[PDB]
Symmetry: C3
Subunit: 314 residues, 3 copies
Amino acid sequence: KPIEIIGAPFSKGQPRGGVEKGPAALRKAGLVEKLKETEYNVRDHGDLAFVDVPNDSPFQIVKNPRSVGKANEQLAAVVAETQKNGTISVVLGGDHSMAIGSISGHARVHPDLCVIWVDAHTDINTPLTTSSGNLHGQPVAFLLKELKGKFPDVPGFSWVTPCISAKDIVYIGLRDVDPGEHYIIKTLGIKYFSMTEVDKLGIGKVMEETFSYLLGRKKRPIHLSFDVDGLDPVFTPATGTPVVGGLSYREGLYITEEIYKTGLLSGLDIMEVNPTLGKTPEEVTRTVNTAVALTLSCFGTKREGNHKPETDYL
Amino acid sequence: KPIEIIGAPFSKGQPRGGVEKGPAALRKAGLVEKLKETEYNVRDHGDLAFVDVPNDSPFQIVKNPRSVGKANEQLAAVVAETQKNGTISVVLGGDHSMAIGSISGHARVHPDLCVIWVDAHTDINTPLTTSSGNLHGQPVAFLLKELKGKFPDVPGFSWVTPCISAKDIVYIGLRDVDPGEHYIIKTLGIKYFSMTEVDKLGIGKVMEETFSYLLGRKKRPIHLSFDVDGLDPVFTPATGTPVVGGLSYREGLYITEEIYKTGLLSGLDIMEVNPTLGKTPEEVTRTVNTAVALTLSCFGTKREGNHKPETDYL
Amino acid sequence: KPIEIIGAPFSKGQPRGGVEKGPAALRKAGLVEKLKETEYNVRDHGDLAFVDVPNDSPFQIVKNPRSVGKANEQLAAVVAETQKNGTISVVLGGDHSMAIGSISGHARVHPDLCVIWVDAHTDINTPLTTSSGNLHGQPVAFLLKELKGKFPDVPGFSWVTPCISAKDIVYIGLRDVDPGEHYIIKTLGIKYFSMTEVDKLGIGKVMEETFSYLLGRKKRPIHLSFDVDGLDPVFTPATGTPVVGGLSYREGLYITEEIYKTGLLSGLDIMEVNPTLGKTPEEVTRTVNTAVALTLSCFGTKREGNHKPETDYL
Ligand SMILES: N/C(=N\O)NCCC[NH3+]
Ligand SMILES: N/C(=N\O)NCCC[NH3+]
Ligand SMILES: N/C(=N\O)NCCC[NH3+]
Ligand SMILES: [Mn+2]
Ligand SMILES: [Mn+2]
Ligand SMILES: [Mn+2]
Ligand SMILES: [Mn+2]
Ligand SMILES: [Mn+2]
Ligand SMILES: [Mn+2]
């Protein structure tokens, strides 16, 4: 199967500069080379160049709506294109608001996909419920069919078409939800495993449930949107919104190891890596390495080991 | 329901200076303000002023018996008073020896309470079994009915009345128990979940058991005495007696999260926070922050999120 | 029952200087005195003096084969001798290549023993499948009957006799396995619990399974070969090959606590402690202390506590 890495050095999704450097960092760590060592064919599409919308006035509270809307529309085009060619797309973030187009594009080619969202945050605030106008905290609100029209249209997002329903998404790692958001997920009946459920059940039982819940009936393409801030700050400190008591390096790899095993991984997002937010160079190396490892894990690398078929090492 | 914060800036329960500053640190973090943001009514009673007993000679090995005895007597009066007004009492330590009065007062108004003791220690040494005369390590020995008269009376504790039996207490996090203590808990049949039981069972099953064991028959008021050194030193390093391999930040919040859900929380103790024992300012912030979080967790705050009832965020 | 500590200050099993200082560090921490405090009789045999083979030319890629071969031959003699006298042998390493003779000797007296190998590495590379000629990474390859003759004879190991089969060994902690090794363990059907299986199952269910798998049918002597690099670097940083995402301090003690309870522990190895690899004195103290703790745990010390029989502490 083929893999296509797509860089999305975007940052207007939130106030902290640096996320745009995310893709450069991840590549600097050899993410592309290390992937070629797997059983997948890898092609790097390079980084997309986002045209900056001049005079992007705030919509009520939302910030840089036109810049974010255009960047995502551009990405969705590219993702749809690679998915059409039957390749698995791997989007390297900036911030998480690039998920709007990543999932959208994907949806265009595979309308029956399910979303597994590893994050400490739900990112489901609507333009009306955000305390900050930061869109990196509103991606899912633009994608949910059930949330259609429950908020005014936003300059630059007209092209978006709610592609997934509250039934096609599962959150893992939830632990810093806003009141509005918590209302939304309880009201819409969205399935989620907050840190307290992971503690109660074990990462193993959790993964087991999420699959029977999203794949119980029909086997379908999987879109993994992975917010690096889902793991505990001790593992991925280089993020804009770290929250303590998160997923461990082990749990993170388990999730990715389980999703590879399903053979259904169709789309991936490695978001929020911010190379400039590392307090010590090591903290950045820690964060990038982890991200890289998780990605490699998504495509085959197991902790038990890997050996090439048909080769007799004896 | 109402909450009453009572400061117990006491430290003669042990040899390390600084615990008395515990309450000041905890408040300095907004513990009171953050609580008000919950669905409970909060009233800060302020810190109690403990009169220092002059010429407090050691009773055999026990140190500052009269000072500790008087300080607890005073606190028990105050706790009894607020419990009477049907308010939930939240005691902010210095050292754990203030648990004698905190639970005693509580017991006077609710004689059918059960105690959940999260600690790395049993604190059940008798005046006869302590290697050190430190009373912060003997609190439960003064409160257990089964231990009545199994040791000589101590100057300043005459007022104490053993209020709870070996059947009304459950330990969670045990991992540094003295021989004498381990004899006591094995002999008396006290229920406990040492770190090995947590590892074997999972924090989830543990909490489940402790409840069916203490509430299986009669639902009763719950007194949570939380020694911050029950969590691993990596989370709460600013304590006098840190012991490696303890409960994680996650497991701590799960305990508090489950106890809130029972709706039975009647009394609480956040002990051993010692702001002067942090090697770096951060270590102290870490420790205070997690103590604050645990407390907020006891009164509602969930990691999955919180939203105000009757408010339509849409 | 009697214990016999045997020092193996050997290091030619790998490139890094220092491991030979392992036994000295462990004693320096009071390992022998602390053991005497247990219900076992302890006898320190002292450190073996290994004669250095001059002109030890590399066998193809394998390094210092004659020195490693002779050192292990000597140890196997000593271990055989103490096992014969019905004592439990506890070998203190240098590197893990000393397991060859540790297990070999053991096997001579107890040919029906099973091996529990806690390590982040399988150490099953053959002289033909090593990227480095480091023998500390080929111990099991010299001990497995199924691997006999699957590689050329190595100068210094003629005395070795494959004593255990792929059925008598269980790995716990695997997370950095080479391709050749992963082929070998998959091909031979070797039972293992890589970090992903620990995450999935929980240390408790893992220990449960390894026992029914190795002791389900016949109860037999147990040889615990413990590579300190099996725990995460945050617990035992002073080792030549640390790999992140390893077993926790708690999980390590659980394993040892469960093995003690079986009453079958017959041989032990505490390998890879390298006092010179600690970045800060504390890192070395951390690593030594936890190795000492694990060892004490193997012989009785429980985290729930210990009291002496027939003594009435009341
Ligand atoms: N880092 C965040 N999502 O990933 N923050 C969202 C903040 C909610 N307004
Ligand atoms: N920190 C302690 N308890 O909470 N220490 C008790 C020491 C036993 N004498
Ligand atoms: N530390 C290691 N095993 O314990 N390394 C083995 C390297 C494989 N050649
Ligand atoms: Mn997030
Ligand atoms: Mn996010
Ligand atoms: Mn304690
Ligand atoms: Mn205590
Ligand atoms: Mn190893
Ligand atoms: Mn090893």
